[PDB]
Amino acid sequence: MRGSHHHHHHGSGALAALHADGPHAGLPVTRSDARVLIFNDWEERKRSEPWLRLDMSDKAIFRRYPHLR
Numbered sequence: 001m002r003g004s005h006h007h008h009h010h011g012s013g014a015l016a017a018l019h020a021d022g023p024h025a026g027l028p029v030t031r032s033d034a035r036v037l038i039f040n041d042w043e044e045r046k047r048s049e050p051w052l053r054l055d056m057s058d059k060a061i062f063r064r065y066p067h068l069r
Contacts, residue, residue, distance in 0.1 A: 008054045012036055013043070024067055031068050034061045 016036040017029045028034040038056045046052040062069050 006053065006055065007057050007060070010035065010039075010056055011054070012039055014040075016040065027067055028065065031058065031061050034065050034068055038064075 012032075012035060014036045016033040018033070019025055019027050019029055028037045035056050038061070039054070042052055042054045046054075
């Protein structure tokens with residue numbers, strides 16, 4: 001338990017493309033698919049829970065989802 005970060009600095013309401021089969025089935029295909037997945041999932045969870053914090057820099061996408069690189 002060390003450190004903290006906040007970057008509610010981005011947002012894009014769209015559809016995300018996912019892999020259908022093999023190693024990555026159900027994962028986003030591009031960095032922008034991963035951003036759009038985080039954003040749409042946050043919009044739904046934020047409509048359920050109004051406090052929800054959003055963090056989706058290029059670094060945060062490659063750290064949460066290492067398969068995009």
